[PDB]
Each structure stands twice: as structure tokens, then as C-alpha cells.
Nucleic acid binder design. Structure first.
Ligand SMILES: [K+]
Ligand SMILES: [Mg+2]
Ligand SMILES: [Mg+2]
Ligand SMILES: [Mg+2]
Ligand SMILES: [Mg+2]
Ligand SMILES: [Mg+2]
Length: 95
RNA sequence: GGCCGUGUGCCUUGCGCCGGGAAACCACGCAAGGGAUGGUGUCAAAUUCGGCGAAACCUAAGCGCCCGCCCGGGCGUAUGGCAACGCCGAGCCAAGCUUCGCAGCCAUUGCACUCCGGCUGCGAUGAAGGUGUAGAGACUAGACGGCACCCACCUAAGGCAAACGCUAUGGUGAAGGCAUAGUCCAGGGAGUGGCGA
RNA sequence: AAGCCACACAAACCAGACGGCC
């Protein structure tokens, strides 16, 4: 239901039919009206397809995002989020 | 369409070998003989533009030699010619494989930051091979062609095996297609004339 | 020379390696 804090969040269950390039923008701002963003890495692999990694800058932006958007049916399809289990190779990269 | 020969290709055998492969086998120089050269299925597209190369075989302008002297001849000779055929650059190509994109759909609920699921179709693509390369050229097929598989035989790195050894993804099963089987038309057969020596 | 190129054309045959004999 919930997850441990993280400057980025994990979201699943989507209509991959979309364009990686496309979906990335259909989030770029879709998930940024309360905080900044770093990168919405997404893949189409038989593994990563159907999932994305919203990256913020501030924990809060995420703490909130994790709620101000959870369970929301994206493209006539629900949604599932969870703070990331491993702070992205961008944050844990620098700090 | 039979027999002799000439050249180029080709395989077999012998011999030589900086050589590639682990091995078989390929390659390369070369000499001599024509015994031997697997099967089914699939593809039929592109078939364009340029350039180098070239045996035998033809002809003898010039040159050399000779008929003692020019005239005229005779002898030798190819880079003049045909041509089996060896290839390059650029362009394009069926289906099979590379890899990228979209569509059925089949499956996926999957925690990542270096990409990448699977048949089917369309497009692009890359490495082969082909095309350019016939008697001018035109159209059909398919084989000796491309591709998949099967078989026979060879060696066995690797994987397997305690081990004698086992096994291909590897290798042998010619070349022909610079028109092969065909149907066309050319060309000669058999005219005229221009270049030419 | 050989050959080569134009327009013209009767056949069978020859004809897409060459030179010969039949
Ligand atoms: K072995
Ligand atoms: Mg050809
Ligand atoms: Mg052999
Ligand atoms: Mg021929
Ligand atoms: Mg023919
Ligand atoms: Mg020929």
C-alpha cells in the first residue's frame, strides 16, 4: 500500500501501447505541480514495460506525489505507486 | 552433331607452400589425366550506370630481315582485332538469416537506471550472393544459382564421458548461367555501301 | 587487312569458346 521514502517513485500497470517518448511527457508535468522533477525513466522491455520511475528533487514532492495521484486510473487503466526501493543512480549517484 | 586439335576454366592425382583452421579442410604455385561430382522443398526479384583485363584464334599497316638498288613482292612479328572469360566503383534485388521502427495478437503485474520477449505482415536496413557480364538484345522457367532441411563420408576444437570413445554449429559431394534449358528475335548463310592499312 | 558500323534481305542449316575434317 505504502513504501519507504525516496526521491523517486515506482508506478506500474499501464498501456505500454504508448510511446516511451510519449509517455515520458504525458507525465513530465502530469507529475509536477507540487515539486520539481529529474527524469521519468521508462522502458518497453518484457520486464520494465508497463512501468515508470518518476524522479523528483524533493522528498516531499514524492511523499505527496505518492498520494496526490495514487490509485488514479491513467488511460482507462488504474495505477499503482510505491516509493522506490533504491534511490536512483542520479541522487544516490551524487549525494 | 560425330572426329581431331588449341586456349581459358574445372576436379582428380603428384609436387612445391610466407600461408588460414585445432583437425578435417580450405588456400596458393605448378605439372599431367579426364573415372568420379548426392536428395527434397523454397525463391524468380533486381535485371542500371560507368572503367580496367585478357589466352588461344585473325589480319600484318610499322619495323627488322630478304628478293643486290625504288617498283613491286616474300619472311617475322601485335596491341590493329575477335573472344572463351578475370574483376572494380556506384546503383538496385526475391526469399533466408542482422538489426531497427508499426500492426493482429500470444503471452507480461514486471523495482528499475548499458541496450535486447515471441510467431505474422509492411518498411528500412547490414553481411552474403546476385545483378552489371549473351550471338545485339526480348520474354518464360529453373538449375550449376540463393535459401531450408535430409542423406553419404571426414575430422572432432568445443560440449559430453570415469573411460575404449561420443557427437557439427564445422568440412567434402567440379566447374557451366559473361544467357544454361526454352521461345523470340538478331548475325552469318547470301546485298549495298562507309571506317580499315 | 581483320574486323567494325550503318540502312537491305531468300531458305534450310549454322549460330551465345576458338581453328580444323566430315
Ligand atoms: K572433442
Ligand atoms: Mg550473368
Ligand atoms: Mg578433395
Ligand atoms: Mg558460356
Ligand atoms: Mg541458351
Ligand atoms: Mg558465350
Amino acid at each position: 500500500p505504502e513504501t519507504r521514502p525516496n526521491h523517486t517513485i515506482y508506478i506500474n500497470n499501464l498501456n505500454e501501447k504508448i510511446k516511451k517518448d510519449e509517455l515520458k511527457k504525458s507525465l513530465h508535468a502530469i507529475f509536477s505541480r507540487f515539486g520539481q522533477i529529474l527524469d521519468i525513466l521508462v522502458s518497453r522491455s518484457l520486464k520494465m514495460r508497463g512501468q515508470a520511475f518518476v524522479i523528483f528533487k524533493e522528498v516531499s514532492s514524492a511523499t505527496n506525489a505518492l498520494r496526490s495521484m495514487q490509485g488514479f486510473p491513467f488511460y482507462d487503466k488504474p495505477m499503482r505507486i510505491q516509493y522506490a526501493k533504491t534511490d536512483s543512480d542520479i541522487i544516490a549517484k551524487m549525494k
